[PDB]
Design an enzyme around this catalytic site. Sequence first.
Site, PDB file in Angstrom:
ATOM      1  CG  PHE A  86      -1.706   1.320   1.307  1.00 19.61           C
ATOM      2  CD1 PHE A  86      -2.926   1.456   0.641  1.00 19.61           C
ATOM      3  CD2 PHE A  86      -1.205   2.399   2.014  1.00 19.61           C
ATOM      4  CE1 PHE A  86      -3.625   2.634   0.676  1.00 19.61           C
ATOM      5  CE2 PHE A  86      -1.906   3.616   2.056  1.00 19.61           C
ATOM      6  CZ  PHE A  86      -3.119   3.729   1.383  1.00 19.61           C
ATOM      7  CG  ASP A 129       6.251   3.283   1.535  1.00 17.25           C
ATOM      8  OD1 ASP A 129       6.410   4.207   2.359  1.00 17.25           O
ATOM      9  OD2 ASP A 129       5.198   3.187   0.862  1.00 17.25           O
ATOM     10  CE  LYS A 171      -0.102   7.138   6.915  1.00  8.93           C
ATOM     11  NZ  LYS A 171       0.171   6.019   5.967  1.00  8.93           N
TER      12      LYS A 171
HETATM   13  C1  LIG Z   1       0.241   6.310   4.540  1.00  7.45           C
HETATM   14  C2  LIG Z   1       1.066   5.531   3.578  1.00  7.45           C
HETATM   15  C3  LIG Z   1       1.287   6.022   2.292  1.00  7.45           C
HETATM   16  C4  LIG Z   1       0.267   6.951   1.597  1.00  7.45           C
HETATM   17  O1  LIG Z   1       0.488   8.297   2.047  1.00  7.45           O
HETATM   18  P1  LIG Z   1      -0.572   9.456   1.991  1.00  7.45           P
HETATM   19  O2  LIG Z   1       0.063  10.501   2.744  1.00  7.45           O
HETATM   20  O3  LIG Z   1      -1.822   8.934   2.543  1.00  7.45           O
HETATM   21  O4  LIG Z   1      -0.653   9.711   0.477  1.00  7.45           O
HETATM   22  C5  LIG Z   1       2.288   5.469   1.527  1.00  7.45           C
HETATM   23  N1  LIG Z   1       3.000   4.382   1.964  1.00  7.45           N
HETATM   24  C6  LIG Z   1       2.744   3.832   3.202  1.00  7.45           C
HETATM   25  C7  LIG Z   1       3.472   2.569   3.595  1.00  7.45           C
HETATM   26  C8  LIG Z   1       1.787   4.433   4.024  1.00  7.45           C
HETATM   27  O5  LIG Z   1       1.528   3.897   5.270  1.00  7.45           O
END
Ligand SMILES: *Cc1c(COP(=O)(O)O)cnc(C)c1O
Lengths: 404, 404
Positions: B142, B228, B257
Amino acid sequence: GPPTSDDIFEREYKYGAHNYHPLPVALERGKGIYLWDVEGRKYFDFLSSYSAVNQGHCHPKIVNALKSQVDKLTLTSRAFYNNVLGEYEEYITKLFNYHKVLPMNTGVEAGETACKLARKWGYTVKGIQKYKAKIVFAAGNFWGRTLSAISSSTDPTSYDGFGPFMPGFDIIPYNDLPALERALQDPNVAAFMVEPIQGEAGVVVPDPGYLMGVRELCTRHQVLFIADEIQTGLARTGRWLAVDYENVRPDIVLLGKALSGGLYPVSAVLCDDDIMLTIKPGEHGSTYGGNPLGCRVAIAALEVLEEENLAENADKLGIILRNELMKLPSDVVTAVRGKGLLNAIVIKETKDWDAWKVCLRLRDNGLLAKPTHGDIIRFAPPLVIKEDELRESIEIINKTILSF
Amino acid sequence: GPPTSDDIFEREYKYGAHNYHPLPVALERGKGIYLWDVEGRKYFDFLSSYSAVNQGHCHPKIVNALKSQVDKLTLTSRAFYNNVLGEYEEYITKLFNYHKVLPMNTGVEAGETACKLARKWGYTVKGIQKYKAKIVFAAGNFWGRTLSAISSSTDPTSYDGFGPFMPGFDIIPYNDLPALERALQDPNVAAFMVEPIQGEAGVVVPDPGYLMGVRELCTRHQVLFIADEIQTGLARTGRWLAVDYENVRPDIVLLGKALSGGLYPVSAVLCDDDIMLTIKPGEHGSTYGGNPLGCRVAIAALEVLEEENLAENADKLGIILRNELMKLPSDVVTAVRGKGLLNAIVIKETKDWDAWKVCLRLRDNGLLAKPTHGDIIRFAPPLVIKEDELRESIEIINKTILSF
Ligand SMILES: *Cc1c(COP(=O)(O)O)cnc(C)c1O
Ligand SMILES: *Cc1c(COP(=O)(O)O)cnc(C)c1O
């Protein structure tokens, strides 16, 4: 760290990506229509952060809205409800007259959402076979830098070297009804996305009647008309939406930039129920989209545009600016164009001078602007500017242009 | 404007898109690890805005950083320099040890940038033929909701109905070295993007040695290792980066985040010069990316994690939480897993109860959490939580689970 302009440039060159080539100016403070660098010098802001600061820098009413909410709540996520989102949604939908709003953060995010909305509507309502939906774009368009956004671009600088492209994106010329009509013959088209005035292309204003024609052609062929008002909307051109000049109602409207007065990334997708509800719970989202903090600043930012009659000011002041710019010589300025406070002049690139040079001298003379194509300079000062200040700015522009 | 929880739910159902199905709770205030609704009730926050509020809600040091910069300057755009971006860049790069940072706003934006960086590097450095570059992803991943992000998704809910997909995206199973090795045999692969721990999938922690193997396989086949850490990074799992547990250095790191402690959308892409400099001036950007305001809050937000030894607290407290959740009966709870303060329990969905029901009662008992798959509940409280508070939270979880 470094308190000198040269030190600031050097530190960024060392620790930051080189994806931008800025005008060598190091700002540290901004208020209304003004910007001050580290050397204490004052400048007229004629870029407005690409139309993100329509209300002027650090507008007091927007700033206080931010200060008031930070102490309370800034982010819960959309897994729970907050008390602010509902208010903002009721206010923005009634202000523009659409049933609903889908809140996002940046301009591209609003554009991606609209493409997802159009594709989903294409398959579920129009009945296009799964994964055959197309979206039509106009050459010169700009809606962001995601892999999807650069896939509809006709600018090599944006897409060259960026892996394989997103299929299903067609491109036709801008300001061309016959081209549109021909393209809409294909029953697999779900939407046509356009900018009422193309900003990054160099403020290209379409002929009168273009938006009316697009509206008719889209309605006739059962194609969604998506208007990208992220740069042209919110009083910038003289109306709440640039589309208002022709009394046209798009199916989907995109707002961004100035929707927060430059204090927070807030963007919005506006449309009616038949389109918006094709997206079910859990099918689309964003972590920060619709947060309490950004909603507070967007309400205040919208209120400032209304209470201060900024569209009217933009409209009246735009005329004076353009009128004055047409007096300049043709060997330097081949064209002047725009609407409201979104304008541009076209410089005659000769072997001695160009738009980048004109901008550097304009900087030396107290005014900040950036070229868009080497021969096109865009002038877009905050909408709060007054006629005397505009008059002063024009003298700087005359002085600069004529000194070459 | 409606002051009741039910009025808040109704207002949103009417003026906002139905892309989310929130837990019926209407919050209006948050401080540290606590959240209060409109009825004045208090709750332990065990979601943390999906790891965006590691430093707790409205942390005083981060809030003051925002208040201090709003009065000065919030947005000039990257067409000009500001005084704050260079400081943040120097700080973040040295903290993680990479030459440079490319600043963006949201998480997906950081992921798109990395994909663009990988494709550009693939063509210009690795020598892949134009538009043949591939990026490998892991099932369960994700990284956002743009058209490109849902194109690598194995979750039907994310991509079904969303027009044709982005080509060049391969998917292999997670926690599987042989599958990775087999995939990297293709000389057209430019990068492999993975989460060190898969959050939205239900906190799936890979086997020890997985990150070391990915590193070795990527280095050997000349493929970029993109980690990520938007959800797993920033002390959440017990280290600055979850990858630190195996001493692995990815080629590209994505942060988002909690990089702003929930006060502003700020995300970052970190990598060295040989990868970062493949993108030239004018080839990538964002309007709000790298703005003065978000940079200020990110510096403060980063300092809070350091000064308060939140990583160490997350590590120590995670053990206690997990140990206690493991005492749970084996007919109600199937699994307990996680690292640091990123954990999850797996509920046995029977015809009588499920994770949504467990969360509703958990809410009635004073604790907020949301399920991720109907049988998985994730527990991620702000890292500022203390042992006594955690102990209190655990009692609520025990009380709730056993009351079924
Ligand atoms: C939250 C999240 C994102 C997506 O980020 P947004 O700020 O919601 O666009 C990308 N990668 C991971 C692993 C995430 O937890
Ligand atoms: C600014 C702009 C965008 C891109 O928005 P960001 O917030 O930079 O992502 C999209 N559409 C138009 C017409 C714009 O001017």
